[PDB]
Ligand SMILES: NC(=O)CC[C@H](N)C(=O)O
């Protein structure tokens with residue numbers, strides 16, 4: 001019934017060219033590399049190479065072929081997605097991109113000298129929604145590190161594995177009010193939130209306490225690959241050798257936490273700190289990070305594969321934490337102006353989240369003095385002012 | 388001559404569809420992702436949206452567009468490549484693949500427990516030639532570590548940076564006749580050859596001695612990416628956390644070499660050993676490794692980019708070393724039967740090289756007791772018996 005509906009949308013011809021069939025199929029934003037339509041793409045190849053004719057659509061083959069992806073095609077082609085007129089949305093995104101390109105900023109990275117090798121004019125924005133509508137511009141294919149942008153993800157790991165009460169037995173859930181590098185605890189001698197460095201160290205201590213570092217990294221990498229829909233998730237070893245021989249404030253924070261005895265029993269501080277460095281050393285592209293902040297923009301389900309990834313409790317908790325203290329000292333101003341859950345990092349990534357609507361990633365090596373990208377902040381302000 | 392080339396390609400008809408142009412390119416074995424034809428690919432892209440005819444190539448657009456790759460296109464379309472009749476060559480490869488799939492083998496990996504998680508039935512073969520002709524089958528897209536296969540590459544890098552006399556001031560050029568884990572030196576208290584573990588450690592000690600590991604890894608990764616034509620050269624951190632907590636023979640070998648004072652002056656043993664582990668922990672796919680062993684099959688020129696990577700002296704030296712002692716104690720039998728320069732690996736990769744013709748890669752997790760893949764050895768024997 002969907003093929004005759006599309007024929008009614010068509011100009012009255014039974015046969016339509018495939019190279020024109022892909023048009024108005026990408027106009028709704030659904031890409032041709034979706035694993036949901038992997039059966040559709042392989043059957044389309046099997047029809048395309050073994051015809052030598054072209055301009056062939058057919059109706060009975062289209063009826064008998066797809067039985068589970070019919071609902072996705074009907075939702076996409078009837079403008080039943082969350083965001084219609086996606087060409088206009090991409091036009092707005094491109095206009096905001098060109099407006100934010102005028103800013104200059106500066107001061108990319110003093111410490112972590114491997115991070116200072118990026119040119120200051122790099123700029124890219126990726127967009128991915130709940131249904132699977134995705135679009136990206138700029139330098140979205142260039143890999144970049146996930147410094148401090150993995151902290152909400154690893155907090156979700158800890159919560160979904162061990163229960164929120166056991167997770168918050170060792171950490172608080174309040175904003176610190178100071179820089180993330182500054183070391184101090186609350187009245188109960190605990191880190192203020194998982195987003196600061198001390199809370200990140202403590203929540204790395206929780207994940208899979210009974211196994212070695214290799215199995216821990218394998219588990220978190222496999223699960224994050226499941227969350228990303230098997231996208232590109234690398235590991236920048238060049239930025240891991242740096243920040244290990246040059247990152248001294250994190251070592252001081254870890255030794256302070258060890259001295260304050262706020263660790264789980266039978267835990268080695270040095271190995272946990274090295275594991276935290278390894279988690280900070282993960283690198284993804286902007287397109288790959290568009291799938292990030294979109295599984296948690298949904299109800300814990302992957303926007304592309306639809307698999308069960310995170311429990312809704314973990315997603316709600318990490319969304320609340322990102323809304324509260326996800327932008328260091330700029331969190332209050334960000335909630336005042338933008339009012340959306342977002343996480344930043346010294347690499348230049350912004351994990352902007354719109355709940356139940358869409359996800360977004362912005363990448364810009366220049367940084368503000370508080371540790372946030374100026375171009376991404378201006379882009380977010382323009383986006384919340386326009387839409 | 389380009390009109391005459393089109394007259395040779397066509398059968399006499401002026402109208403040639405894009406479907407006819409996109410076929411017989413895979414017959415020539417030149418893939419669409421070649422940066423040499425990147426301007427031709429850009430022409431194809433711009434004429435896919437703007438041709439005003441639909442499924443048409445036209446003579447005049449091809450005349451006015453190709454302005455730097457006339458020689459490559461003319462050599463490709465007149466069967467001037469080193470390997471003609473690529474369909475027969477791929478059929479031979481498929482027959483050898485089916486013959487080698489019958490064997491079982493066993494004994495995947497005992498130590499490095501992260502390496503033991505691979506499936507024993509995984510099997511893939513990738514092929515690339517000097518001109519750029521390539522073909523792959525099986526599991527060619529699954530990444531795997533480059534354990535013991537990066538040693539000729541790092542040896543070539545060290546030779547290119549330093550000079551043969553300065554490289555061999557510390558390392559001999561003779562086979563050992565024992566396993567790579569055996570802890571002994573020659574009469575002059577030196578490692579026997581760069582292929583074994585001690586020689587690999589010493590030649591890692593020589594690359595950029597005055598610079599820390601953070602920029603050394605970036606340097607060697609830049610050279611590897613230039614050799615690979617910007618293909619997928621990843622880093623498996625899971626297999627780097629393992630083999631560091633469990634690799635004990637390498638630590639004993641390094642401490643023995645430090646005691647024998649064969650290291651360069653002012654060199655830390657632990658940091659160089661960690662850098663060696665990092666260099667062994669680099670992971671690639673079968674296709675990306677097939678891009679390798681073709682630059683050194685050529686005179687140091689990358690088959691894909693066409694640039695210059697390695698000096699001919701380094702290429703000749705590493706080819707001679709791989710021919711002499713590139714298969715551990717099985718090197719004599721390999722030269723007796725196959726007689727081609729190949730490098731083995733505990734991961735399962737085989738870096739089979741045919742000089743000035745074509746490069747290869749065979750990937751099989753099961754291993755013989757000597758330290759080589761059984762399926763790869765059988766495949767090499769069948770290949771040298773057939774062609
Ligand atoms: N923003 C962070 O704290 C993580 C990255 C930072 N450079 C660090 O490791 O201290």
Ligand SMILES: NC(=O)CC[C@H](N)C(=O)O
Pocket residue numbers: 534535567584630634637664667732733
């Ligand atoms: N074949 C090998 O020896 C490589 C395994 C490990 N990298 C080692 O040096 O021992």
